[PDB]
C-alpha cells in the first residue's frame, strides 16, 4: 500500500464547506460549517436532523442506515428555517460512526 | 470558541473527491484521488505539478505561494495529457504545509 495520508483539518473543512453538517446514528447533529450555524436561529449542534432539514432527493426518509446505503446519490436537502436547498454527497465515516453532508446551496 | 472537531479521514476524502490532489511547497504531488491516478498515463505522486497540469484560471504562475494567495478564486486546471479540465478550489493547510485542490471536471 501507498495509502492516502492527508486530509483537511476540521477547521479547513468548515471554511471550505461553510454549509456542511455531520450527524450520528441517533440522528443528532454533531458538527456544522461556519455559515450554516451563523444563519440558524437555533443552535444546530445537539439537535435532531429532522427538526432542521427535509430530504427532497432521493425520495427517502431521513434515516441513518437508509442514507448510509446510498454513497453515490446526489442529495438535495431543504433547510427548514428559510427553505434554502442544499445539494451534495452523504459520506459515511465508520470509525467515528457519523455521516458528513458536504453540501452547498444550489442555484 | 466552539471549534469543529471532526473531518473526513484521508481515505474518505479520496472517495468523496476522486479527482483531488494535494501538493507541498516543493510543488511535488503528495496524494491524489482514486480516479485521477486511473486516467493518468504515469503515476502522479512524487511528480512535480507543472509536469502534469497547467493553470488556465486565474492567470498566475504555478508556485505554491501565489496559489496560496488566491483562497477564494476558482481554479481551472488543465491536465496536460488529455486536455481535460478540472475546476475547483485551492485550500492551504498550514500544519502539513500542503494545498489541496478539490476539483472535478
mmCIF file with all atom_site columns, C-alpha atoms in Angstrom:
data_model
loop_
_atom_site.group_PDB
_atom_site.id
_atom_site.type_symbol
_atom_site.label_atom_id
_atom_site.label_alt_id
_atom_site.label_comp_id
_atom_site.label_asym_id
_atom_site.label_entity_id
_atom_site.label_seq_id
_atom_site.pdbx_PDB_ins_code
_atom_site.Cartn_x
_atom_site.Cartn_y
_atom_site.Cartn_z
_atom_site.occupancy
_atom_site.B_iso_or_equiv
_atom_site.pdbx_formal_charge
_atom_site.auth_seq_id
_atom_site.auth_comp_id
_atom_site.auth_asym_id
_atom_site.auth_atom_id
_atom_site.pdbx_PDB_model_num
ATOM 1   C CA . UNK A 1 1   ? 0.000   0.000  0.000   1.00 0.00 ? 1   UNK A CA 1
ATOM 2   C CA . UNK A 1 2   ? 0.743   3.692  -0.551  1.00 0.00 ? 2   UNK A CA 1
ATOM 3   C CA . UNK A 1 3   ? -2.407  4.895  1.210   1.00 0.00 ? 3   UNK A CA 1
ATOM 4   C CA . UNK A 1 4   ? -3.686  8.452  1.177   1.00 0.00 ? 4   UNK A CA 1
ATOM 5   C CA . UNK A 1 5   ? -2.461  10.064 4.384   1.00 0.00 ? 5   UNK A CA 1
ATOM 6   C CA . UNK A 1 6   ? -3.609  13.748 4.239   1.00 0.00 ? 6   UNK A CA 1
ATOM 7   C CA . UNK A 1 7   ? -6.939  15.377 4.888   1.00 0.00 ? 7   UNK A CA 1
ATOM 8   C CA . UNK A 1 8   ? -8.461  18.763 5.613   1.00 0.00 ? 8   UNK A CA 1
ATOM 9   C CA . UNK A 1 9   ? -8.287  19.726 9.246   1.00 0.00 ? 9   UNK A CA 1
ATOM 10  C CA . UNK A 1 10  ? -11.681 20.205 10.876  1.00 0.00 ? 10  UNK A CA 1
ATOM 11  C CA . UNK A 1 11  ? -11.140 23.984 10.637  1.00 0.00 ? 11  UNK A CA 1
ATOM 12  C CA . UNK A 1 12  ? -10.352 23.970 6.910   1.00 0.00 ? 12  UNK A CA 1
ATOM 13  C CA . UNK A 1 13  ? -13.327 21.630 6.281   1.00 0.00 ? 13  UNK A CA 1
ATOM 14  C CA . UNK A 1 14  ? -15.584 24.231 7.970   1.00 0.00 ? 14  UNK A CA 1
ATOM 15  C CA . UNK A 1 15  ? -14.146 27.016 5.721   1.00 0.00 ? 15  UNK A CA 1
ATOM 16  C CA . UNK A 1 16  ? -14.211 25.005 2.507   1.00 0.00 ? 16  UNK A CA 1
ATOM 17  C CA . UNK A 1 17  ? -17.697 23.702 3.262   1.00 0.00 ? 17  UNK A CA 1
ATOM 18  C CA . UNK A 1 18  ? -19.439 26.500 5.270   1.00 0.00 ? 18  UNK A CA 1
ATOM 19  C CA . UNK A 1 19  ? -22.786 24.649 4.865   1.00 0.00 ? 19  UNK A CA 1
ATOM 20  C CA . UNK A 1 20  ? -21.650 21.124 5.722   1.00 0.00 ? 20  UNK A CA 1
ATOM 21  C CA . UNK A 1 21  ? -23.051 19.172 8.641   1.00 0.00 ? 21  UNK A CA 1
ATOM 22  C CA . UNK A 1 22  ? -22.298 15.794 10.248  1.00 0.00 ? 22  UNK A CA 1
ATOM 23  C CA . UNK A 1 23  ? -24.710 13.630 12.257  1.00 0.00 ? 23  UNK A CA 1
ATOM 24  C CA . UNK A 1 24  ? -24.579 10.410 14.252  1.00 0.00 ? 24  UNK A CA 1
ATOM 25  C CA . UNK A 1 25  ? -26.642 7.191  14.247  1.00 0.00 ? 25  UNK A CA 1
ATOM 26  C CA . UNK A 1 26  ? -29.019 8.784  16.806  1.00 0.00 ? 26  UNK A CA 1
ATOM 27  C CA . UNK A 1 27  ? -29.775 11.478 14.182  1.00 0.00 ? 27  UNK A CA 1
ATOM 28  C CA . UNK A 1 28  ? -28.045 14.126 16.343  1.00 0.00 ? 28  UNK A CA 1
ATOM 29  C CA . UNK A 1 29  ? -26.150 16.917 14.595  1.00 0.00 ? 29  UNK A CA 1
ATOM 30  C CA . UNK A 1 30  ? -22.616 16.913 15.953  1.00 0.00 ? 30  UNK A CA 1
ATOM 31  C CA . UNK A 1 31  ? -20.953 19.439 13.671  1.00 0.00 ? 31  UNK A CA 1
ATOM 32  C CA . UNK A 1 32  ? -21.782 22.253 11.189  1.00 0.00 ? 32  UNK A CA 1
ATOM 33  C CA . UNK A 1 33  ? -19.866 24.611 8.899   1.00 0.00 ? 33  UNK A CA 1
ATOM 34  C CA . UNK A 1 34  ? -19.447 28.262 9.971   1.00 0.00 ? 34  UNK A CA 1
ATOM 35  C CA . UNK A 1 35  ? -22.151 29.890 7.814   1.00 0.00 ? 35  UNK A CA 1
ATOM 36  C CA . UNK A 1 36  ? -24.868 27.285 8.444   1.00 0.00 ? 36  UNK A CA 1
ATOM 37  C CA . UNK A 1 37  ? -24.746 27.720 12.261  1.00 0.00 ? 37  UNK A CA 1
ATOM 38  C CA . UNK A 1 38  ? -24.463 31.518 11.906  1.00 0.00 ? 38  UNK A CA 1
ATOM 39  C CA . UNK A 1 39  ? -27.748 31.746 9.926   1.00 0.00 ? 39  UNK A CA 1
ATOM 40  C CA . UNK A 1 40  ? -29.745 29.276 12.008  1.00 0.00 ? 40  UNK A CA 1
ATOM 41  C CA . UNK A 1 41  ? -31.935 30.954 14.709  1.00 0.00 ? 41  UNK A CA 1
ATOM 42  C CA . UNK A 1 42  ? -31.435 27.943 16.975  1.00 0.00 ? 42  UNK A CA 1
ATOM 43  C CA . UNK A 1 43  ? -28.110 26.200 17.714  1.00 0.00 ? 43  UNK A CA 1
ATOM 44  C CA . UNK A 1 44  ? -27.977 23.137 15.444  1.00 0.00 ? 44  UNK A CA 1
ATOM 45  C CA . UNK A 1 45  ? -25.390 21.013 17.272  1.00 0.00 ? 45  UNK A CA 1
ATOM 46  C CA . UNK A 1 46  ? -27.198 18.585 19.623  1.00 0.00 ? 46  UNK A CA 1
ATOM 47  C CA . UNK A 1 47  ? -30.487 18.788 17.750  1.00 0.00 ? 47  UNK A CA 1
ATOM 48  C CA . UNK A 1 48  ? -32.116 16.064 15.662  1.00 0.00 ? 48  UNK A CA 1
ATOM 49  C CA . UNK A 1 49  ? -31.603 16.487 11.922  1.00 0.00 ? 49  UNK A CA 1
ATOM 50  C CA . UNK A 1 50  ? -35.272 16.265 11.010  1.00 0.00 ? 50  UNK A CA 1
ATOM 51  C CA . UNK A 1 51  ? -36.193 19.258 13.193  1.00 0.00 ? 51  UNK A CA 1
ATOM 52  C CA . UNK A 1 52  ? -33.999 21.243 10.820  1.00 0.00 ? 52  UNK A CA 1
ATOM 53  C CA . UNK A 1 53  ? -33.801 19.534 7.385   1.00 0.00 ? 53  UNK A CA 1
ATOM 54  C CA . UNK A 1 54  ? -36.022 17.746 4.929   1.00 0.00 ? 54  UNK A CA 1
ATOM 55  C CA . UNK A 1 55  ? -34.630 15.449 2.204   1.00 0.00 ? 55  UNK A CA 1
ATOM 56  C CA . UNK A 1 56  ? -36.020 16.427 -1.226  1.00 0.00 ? 56  UNK A CA 1
ATOM 57  C CA . UNK A 1 57  ? -33.966 13.929 -3.326  1.00 0.00 ? 57  UNK A CA 1
ATOM 58  C CA . UNK A 1 58  ? -33.727 10.992 -3.301  1.00 0.00 ? 58  UNK A CA 1
ATOM 59  C CA . UNK A 1 59  ? -37.278 10.291 -2.107  1.00 0.00 ? 59  UNK A CA 1
ATOM 60  C CA . UNK A 1 60  ? -36.299 8.594  1.149   1.00 0.00 ? 60  UNK A CA 1
ATOM 61  C CA . UNK A 1 61  ? -36.930 9.085  4.843   1.00 0.00 ? 61  UNK A CA 1
ATOM 62  C CA . UNK A 1 62  ? -34.293 10.875 6.868   1.00 0.00 ? 62  UNK A CA 1
ATOM 63  C CA . UNK A 1 63  ? -32.921 7.635  8.367   1.00 0.00 ? 63  UNK A CA 1
ATOM 64  C CA . UNK A 1 64  ? -29.236 6.922  9.094   1.00 0.00 ? 64  UNK A CA 1
ATOM 65  C CA . UNK A 1 65  ? -28.920 3.453  7.554   1.00 0.00 ? 65  UNK A CA 1
ATOM 66  C CA . UNK A 1 66  ? -31.064 4.397  4.517   1.00 0.00 ? 66  UNK A CA 1
ATOM 67  C CA . UNK A 1 67  ? -28.741 7.367  3.810   1.00 0.00 ? 67  UNK A CA 1
ATOM 68  C CA . UNK A 1 68  ? -25.569 5.344  4.510   1.00 0.00 ? 68  UNK A CA 1
ATOM 69  C CA . UNK A 1 69  ? -26.633 2.690  1.992   1.00 0.00 ? 69  UNK A CA 1
ATOM 70  C CA . UNK A 1 70  ? -26.537 5.319  -0.810  1.00 0.00 ? 70  UNK A CA 1
ATOM 71  C CA . UNK A 1 71  ? -22.960 6.752  -1.067  1.00 0.00 ? 71  UNK A CA 1
ATOM 72  C CA . UNK A 1 72  ? -23.159 7.800  -4.761  1.00 0.00 ? 72  UNK A CA 1
ATOM 73  C CA . UNK A 1 73  ? -26.532 9.578  -4.612  1.00 0.00 ? 73  UNK A CA 1
ATOM 74  C CA . UNK A 1 74  ? -26.655 13.319 -5.006  1.00 0.00 ? 74  UNK A CA 1
ATOM 75  C CA . UNK A 1 75  ? -28.667 14.508 -2.028  1.00 0.00 ? 75  UNK A CA 1
ATOM 76  C CA . UNK A 1 76  ? -30.951 17.530 -2.139  1.00 0.00 ? 76  UNK A CA 1
ATOM 77  C CA . UNK A 1 77  ? -31.820 18.885 1.283   1.00 0.00 ? 77  UNK A CA 1
ATOM 78  C CA . UNK A 1 78  ? -34.068 21.697 2.366   1.00 0.00 ? 78  UNK A CA 1
ATOM 79  C CA . UNK A 1 79  ? -33.075 23.811 5.381   1.00 0.00 ? 79  UNK A CA 1
ATOM 80  C CA . UNK A 1 80  ? -36.464 24.165 7.100   1.00 0.00 ? 80  UNK A CA 1
ATOM 81  C CA . UNK A 1 81  ? -35.873 27.617 8.619   1.00 0.00 ? 81  UNK A CA 1
ATOM 82  C CA . UNK A 1 82  ? -35.693 29.507 5.300   1.00 0.00 ? 82  UNK A CA 1
ATOM 83  C CA . UNK A 1 83  ? -36.476 26.877 2.645   1.00 0.00 ? 83  UNK A CA 1
ATOM 84  C CA . UNK A 1 84  ? -32.965 27.183 1.162   1.00 0.00 ? 84  UNK A CA 1
ATOM 85  C CA . UNK A 1 85  ? -31.990 24.000 -0.698  1.00 0.00 ? 85  UNK A CA 1
ATOM 86  C CA . UNK A 1 86  ? -28.565 22.412 -0.287  1.00 0.00 ? 86  UNK A CA 1
ATOM 87  C CA . UNK A 1 87  ? -27.065 19.881 -2.670  1.00 0.00 ? 87  UNK A CA 1
ATOM 88  C CA . UNK A 1 88  ? -24.273 17.345 -2.165  1.00 0.00 ? 88  UNK A CA 1
ATOM 89  C CA . UNK A 1 89  ? -22.951 13.964 -1.071  1.00 0.00 ? 89  UNK A CA 1
ATOM 90  C CA . UNK A 1 90  ? -23.621 11.993 2.083   1.00 0.00 ? 90  UNK A CA 1
ATOM 91  C CA . UNK A 1 91  ? -20.403 10.261 3.158   1.00 0.00 ? 91  UNK A CA 1
ATOM 92  C CA . UNK A 1 92  ? -20.345 7.625  5.866   1.00 0.00 ? 92  UNK A CA 1
ATOM 93  C CA . UNK A 1 93  ? -17.393 7.682  8.339   1.00 0.00 ? 93  UNK A CA 1
ATOM 94  C CA . UNK A 1 94  ? -17.356 4.212  10.053  1.00 0.00 ? 94  UNK A CA 1
ATOM 95  C CA . UNK A 1 95  ? -14.538 4.796  12.587  1.00 0.00 ? 95  UNK A CA 1
ATOM 96  C CA . UNK A 1 96  ? -16.432 7.723  14.169  1.00 0.00 ? 96  UNK A CA 1
ATOM 97  C CA . UNK A 1 97  ? -19.934 6.491  13.139  1.00 0.00 ? 97  UNK A CA 1
ATOM 98  C CA . UNK A 1 98  ? -21.063 9.756  11.534  1.00 0.00 ? 98  UNK A CA 1
ATOM 99  C CA . UNK A 1 99  ? -22.286 10.905 8.111   1.00 0.00 ? 99  UNK A CA 1
ATOM 100 C CA . UNK A 1 100 ? -20.987 14.128 6.634   1.00 0.00 ? 100 UNK A CA 1
ATOM 101 C CA . UNK A 1 101 ? -23.304 16.051 4.369   1.00 0.00 ? 101 UNK A CA 1
ATOM 102 C CA . UNK A 1 102 ? -20.871 18.007 2.230   1.00 0.00 ? 102 UNK A CA 1
ATOM 103 C CA . UNK A 1 103 ? -23.360 20.424 0.790   1.00 0.00 ? 103 UNK A CA 1
ATOM 104 C CA . UNK A 1 104 ? -23.637 23.854 -0.708  1.00 0.00 ? 104 UNK A CA 1
ATOM 105 C CA . UNK A 1 105 ? -26.597 25.986 -1.883  1.00 0.00 ? 105 UNK A CA 1
ATOM 106 C CA . UNK A 1 106 ? -27.612 25.021 -5.396  1.00 0.00 ? 106 UNK A CA 1
ATOM 107 C CA . UNK A 1 107 ? -28.692 27.693 -7.876  1.00 0.00 ? 107 UNK A CA 1
ATOM 108 C CA . UNK B 2 1   ? -14.605 29.107 20.876  1.00 0.00 ? 1   UNK B CA 1
ATOM 109 C CA . UNK B 2 2   ? -16.647 26.034 19.872  1.00 0.00 ? 2   UNK B CA 1
ATOM 110 C CA . UNK B 2 3   ? -14.339 24.844 17.049  1.00 0.00 ? 3   UNK B CA 1
ATOM 111 C CA . UNK B 2 4   ? -15.190 21.968 14.674  1.00 0.00 ? 4   UNK B CA 1
ATOM 112 C CA . UNK B 2 5   ? -13.609 18.694 15.757  1.00 0.00 ? 5   UNK B CA 1
ATOM 113 C CA . UNK B 2 6   ? -14.385 16.149 13.006  1.00 0.00 ? 6   UNK B CA 1
ATOM 114 C CA . UNK B 2 7   ? -13.119 15.701 9.484   1.00 0.00 ? 7   UNK B CA 1
ATOM 115 C CA . UNK B 2 8   ? -13.088 13.118 6.697   1.00 0.00 ? 8   UNK B CA 1
ATOM 116 C CA . UNK B 2 9   ? -10.322 10.513 7.016   1.00 0.00 ? 9   UNK B CA 1
ATOM 117 C CA . UNK B 2 10  ? -7.770  10.596 4.122   1.00 0.00 ? 10  UNK B CA 1
ATOM 118 C CA . UNK B 2 11  ? -9.468  7.517  2.670   1.00 0.00 ? 11  UNK B CA 1
ATOM 119 C CA . UNK B 2 12  ? -12.916 9.090  2.731   1.00 0.00 ? 12  UNK B CA 1
ATOM 120 C CA . UNK B 2 13  ? -11.586 12.232 1.086   1.00 0.00 ? 13  UNK B CA 1
ATOM 121 C CA . UNK B 2 14  ? -10.167 10.259 -1.843  1.00 0.00 ? 14  UNK B CA 1
ATOM 122 C CA . UNK B 2 15  ? -13.603 8.722  -2.319  1.00 0.00 ? 15  UNK B CA 1
ATOM 123 C CA . UNK B 2 16  ? -15.596 11.980 -1.844  1.00 0.00 ? 16  UNK B CA 1
ATOM 124 C CA . UNK B 2 17  ? -13.275 13.864 -4.196  1.00 0.00 ? 17  UNK B CA 1
ATOM 125 C CA . UNK B 2 18  ? -11.871 11.278 -6.643  1.00 0.00 ? 18  UNK B CA 1
ATOM 126 C CA . UNK B 2 19  ? -10.155 13.969 -8.770  1.00 0.00 ? 19  UNK B CA 1
ATOM 127 C CA . UNK B 2 20  ? -8.449  15.828 -5.948  1.00 0.00 ? 20  UNK B CA 1
ATOM 128 C CA . UNK B 2 21  ? -4.719  16.166 -5.411  1.00 0.00 ? 21  UNK B CA 1
ATOM 129 C CA . UNK B 2 22  ? -2.541  17.737 -2.721  1.00 0.00 ? 22  UNK B CA 1
ATOM 130 C CA . UNK B 2 23  ? 0.947   19.155 -3.155  1.00 0.00 ? 23  UNK B CA 1
ATOM 131 C CA . UNK B 2 24  ? 3.703   20.573 -0.970  1.00 0.00 ? 24  UNK B CA 1
ATOM 132 C CA . UNK B 2 25  ? 5.869   23.736 -1.089  1.00 0.00 ? 25  UNK B CA 1
ATOM 133 C CA . UNK B 2 26  ? 8.350   21.976 -3.369  1.00 0.00 ? 26  UNK B CA 1
ATOM 134 C CA . UNK B 2 27  ? 5.422   21.557 -5.830  1.00 0.00 ? 27  UNK B CA 1
ATOM 135 C CA . UNK B 2 28  ? 5.576   17.793 -5.754  1.00 0.00 ? 28  UNK B CA 1
ATOM 136 C CA . UNK B 2 29  ? 2.242   15.946 -5.699  1.00 0.00 ? 29  UNK B CA 1
ATOM 137 C CA . UNK B 2 30  ? 1.793   14.117 -2.395  1.00 0.00 ? 30  UNK B CA 1
ATOM 138 C CA . UNK B 2 31  ? -1.642  12.468 -2.896  1.00 0.00 ? 31  UNK B CA 1
ATOM 139 C CA . UNK B 2 32  ? -4.419  12.219 -5.483  1.00 0.00 ? 32  UNK B CA 1
ATOM 140 C CA . UNK B 2 33  ? -7.996  10.934 -5.518  1.00 0.00 ? 33  UNK B CA 1
ATOM 141 C CA . UNK B 2 34  ? -8.702  7.455  -6.881  1.00 0.00 ? 34  UNK B CA 1
ATOM 142 C CA . UNK B 2 35  ? -9.983  8.318  -10.360 1.00 0.00 ? 35  UNK B CA 1
ATOM 143 C CA . UNK B 2 36  ? -7.209  10.821 -11.000 1.00 0.00 ? 36  UNK B CA 1
ATOM 144 C CA . UNK B 2 37  ? -4.477  8.128  -10.780 1.00 0.00 ? 37  UNK B CA 1
ATOM 145 C CA . UNK B 2 38  ? -6.581  5.891  -13.058 1.00 0.00 ? 38  UNK B CA 1
ATOM 146 C CA . UNK B 2 39  ? -6.810  8.322  -16.030 1.00 0.00 ? 39  UNK B CA 1
ATOM 147 C CA . UNK B 2 40  ? -3.165  9.350  -15.766 1.00 0.00 ? 40  UNK B CA 1
ATOM 148 C CA . UNK B 2 41  ? -0.657  7.608  -18.112 1.00 0.00 ? 41  UNK B CA 1
ATOM 149 C CA . UNK B 2 42  ? 2.016   7.884  -15.386 1.00 0.00 ? 42  UNK B CA 1
ATOM 150 C CA . UNK B 2 43  ? 1.996   7.868  -11.550 1.00 0.00 ? 43  UNK B CA 1
ATOM 151 C CA . UNK B 2 44  ? 1.462   11.410 -10.233 1.00 0.00 ? 44  UNK B CA 1
ATOM 152 C CA . UNK B 2 45  ? 2.570   11.147 -6.621  1.00 0.00 ? 45  UNK B CA 1
ATOM 153 C CA . UNK B 2 46  ? 6.168   12.376 -6.280  1.00 0.00 ? 46  UNK B CA 1
ATOM 154 C CA . UNK B 2 47  ? 5.933   14.249 -9.593  1.00 0.00 ? 47  UNK B CA 1
ATOM 155 C CA . UNK B 2 48  ? 6.027   17.998 -9.986  1.00 0.00 ? 48  UNK B CA 1
ATOM 156 C CA . UNK B 2 49  ? 2.629   19.562 -10.645 1.00 0.00 ? 49  UNK B CA 1
ATOM 157 C CA . UNK B 2 50  ? 3.773   21.625 -13.657 1.00 0.00 ? 50  UNK B CA 1
ATOM 158 C CA . UNK B 2 51  ? 4.765   18.413 -15.443 1.00 0.00 ? 51  UNK B CA 1
ATOM 159 C CA . UNK B 2 52  ? 1.137   17.300 -15.482 1.00 0.00 ? 52  UNK B CA 1
ATOM 160 C CA . UNK B 2 53  ? -1.153  20.275 -15.073 1.00 0.00 ? 53  UNK B CA 1
ATOM 161 C CA . UNK B 2 54  ? -1.297  23.878 -16.139 1.00 0.00 ? 54  UNK B CA 1
ATOM 162 C CA . UNK B 2 55  ? -3.330  26.700 -14.641 1.00 0.00 ? 55  UNK B CA 1
ATOM 163 C CA . UNK B 2 56  ? -5.897  28.188 -17.035 1.00 0.00 ? 56  UNK B CA 1
ATOM 164 C CA . UNK B 2 57  ? -7.624  30.413 -14.421 1.00 0.00 ? 57  UNK B CA 1
ATOM 165 C CA . UNK B 2 58  ? -6.699  32.612 -12.622 1.00 0.00 ? 58  UNK B CA 1
ATOM 166 C CA . UNK B 2 59  ? -3.687  33.828 -14.632 1.00 0.00 ? 59  UNK B CA 1
ATOM 167 C CA . UNK B 2 60  ? -0.854  33.135 -12.189 1.00 0.00 ? 60  UNK B CA 1
ATOM 168 C CA . UNK B 2 61  ? 2.408   31.214 -12.138 1.00 0.00 ? 61  UNK B CA 1
ATOM 169 C CA . UNK B 2 62  ? 2.413   27.669 -10.849 1.00 0.00 ? 62  UNK B CA 1
ATOM 170 C CA . UNK B 2 63  ? 4.059   28.371 -7.474  1.00 0.00 ? 63  UNK B CA 1
ATOM 171 C CA . UNK B 2 64  ? 2.761   27.384 -4.058  1.00 0.00 ? 64  UNK B CA 1
ATOM 172 C CA . UNK B 2 65  ? 2.750   30.930 -2.602  1.00 0.00 ? 65  UNK B CA 1
ATOM 173 C CA . UNK B 2 66  ? 0.831   32.581 -5.478  1.00 0.00 ? 66  UNK B CA 1
ATOM 174 C CA . UNK B 2 67  ? -1.779  29.796 -5.329  1.00 0.00 ? 67  UNK B CA 1
ATOM 175 C CA . UNK B 2 68  ? -1.906  30.178 -1.532  1.00 0.00 ? 68  UNK B CA 1
ATOM 176 C CA . UNK B 2 69  ? -2.838  33.833 -2.089  1.00 0.00 ? 69  UNK B CA 1
ATOM 177 C CA . UNK B 2 70  ? -5.995  33.099 -4.107  1.00 0.00 ? 70  UNK B CA 1
ATOM 178 C CA . UNK B 2 71  ? -8.083  31.429 -1.343  1.00 0.00 ? 71  UNK B CA 1
ATOM 179 C CA . UNK B 2 72  ? -11.446 32.351 -2.858  1.00 0.00 ? 72  UNK B CA 1
ATOM 180 C CA . UNK B 2 73  ? -10.643 32.157 -6.585  1.00 0.00 ? 73  UNK B CA 1
ATOM 181 C CA . UNK B 2 74  ? -11.994 29.457 -8.863  1.00 0.00 ? 74  UNK B CA 1
ATOM 182 C CA . UNK B 2 75  ? -9.189  27.438 -10.335 1.00 0.00 ? 75  UNK B CA 1
ATOM 183 C CA . UNK B 2 76  ? -9.414  25.753 -13.654 1.00 0.00 ? 76  UNK B CA 1
ATOM 184 C CA . UNK B 2 77  ? -6.547  23.402 -14.258 1.00 0.00 ? 77  UNK B CA 1
ATOM 185 C CA . UNK B 2 78  ? -5.816  21.544 -17.441 1.00 0.00 ? 78  UNK B CA 1
ATOM 186 C CA . UNK B 2 79  ? -4.476  18.002 -17.376 1.00 0.00 ? 79  UNK B CA 1
ATOM 187 C CA . UNK B 2 80  ? -1.594  18.348 -19.899 1.00 0.00 ? 80  UNK B CA 1
ATOM 188 C CA . UNK B 2 81  ? -2.109  14.809 -21.038 1.00 0.00 ? 81  UNK B CA 1
ATOM 189 C CA . UNK B 2 82  ? -5.684  14.676 -22.407 1.00 0.00 ? 82  UNK B CA 1
ATOM 190 C CA . UNK B 2 83  ? -6.645  18.378 -22.108 1.00 0.00 ? 83  UNK B CA 1
ATOM 191 C CA . UNK B 2 84  ? -9.316  17.511 -19.559 1.00 0.00 ? 84  UNK B CA 1
ATOM 192 C CA . UNK B 2 85  ? -10.180 20.459 -17.337 1.00 0.00 ? 85  UNK B CA 1
ATOM 193 C CA . UNK B 2 86  ? -10.618 20.432 -13.587 1.00 0.00 ? 86  UNK B CA 1
ATOM 194 C CA . UNK B 2 87  ? -12.477 23.192 -11.819 1.00 0.00 ? 87  UNK B CA 1
ATOM 195 C CA . UNK B 2 88  ? -12.399 23.747 -8.082  1.00 0.00 ? 88  UNK B CA 1
ATOM 196 C CA . UNK B 2 89  ? -10.929 25.381 -5.007  1.00 0.00 ? 89  UNK B CA 1
ATOM 197 C CA . UNK B 2 90  ? -7.343  25.506 -3.708  1.00 0.00 ? 90  UNK B CA 1
ATOM 198 C CA . UNK B 2 91  ? -7.137  25.226 0.070   1.00 0.00 ? 91  UNK B CA 1
ATOM 199 C CA . UNK B 2 92  ? -3.975  25.803 2.012   1.00 0.00 ? 92  UNK B CA 1
ATOM 200 C CA . UNK B 2 93  ? -3.444  23.668 5.156   1.00 0.00 ? 93  UNK B CA 1
ATOM 201 C CA . UNK B 2 94  ? -0.778  25.306 7.475   1.00 0.00 ? 94  UNK B CA 1
ATOM 202 C CA . UNK B 2 95  ? 0.203   22.287 9.589   1.00 0.00 ? 95  UNK B CA 1
ATOM 203 C CA . UNK B 2 96  ? 1.114   19.701 6.951   1.00 0.00 ? 96  UNK B CA 1
ATOM 204 C CA . UNK B 2 97  ? 2.043   22.670 4.735   1.00 0.00 ? 97  UNK B CA 1
ATOM 205 C CA . UNK B 2 98  ? 0.080   21.444 1.706   1.00 0.00 ? 98  UNK B CA 1
ATOM 206 C CA . UNK B 2 99  ? -2.561  22.816 -0.685  1.00 0.00 ? 99  UNK B CA 1
ATOM 207 C CA . UNK B 2 100 ? -5.496  20.556 -1.603  1.00 0.00 ? 100 UNK B CA 1
ATOM 208 C CA . UNK B 2 101 ? -7.029  21.082 -4.989  1.00 0.00 ? 101 UNK B CA 1
ATOM 209 C CA . UNK B 2 102 ? -10.604 19.878 -4.543  1.00 0.00 ? 102 UNK B CA 1
ATOM 210 C CA . UNK B 2 103 ? -11.847 19.850 -8.093  1.00 0.00 ? 103 UNK B CA 1
ATOM 211 C CA . UNK B 2 104 ? -13.538 17.758 -10.746 1.00 0.00 ? 104 UNK B CA 1
ATOM 212 C CA . UNK B 2 105 ? -14.494 18.041 -14.436 1.00 0.00 ? 105 UNK B CA 1
#
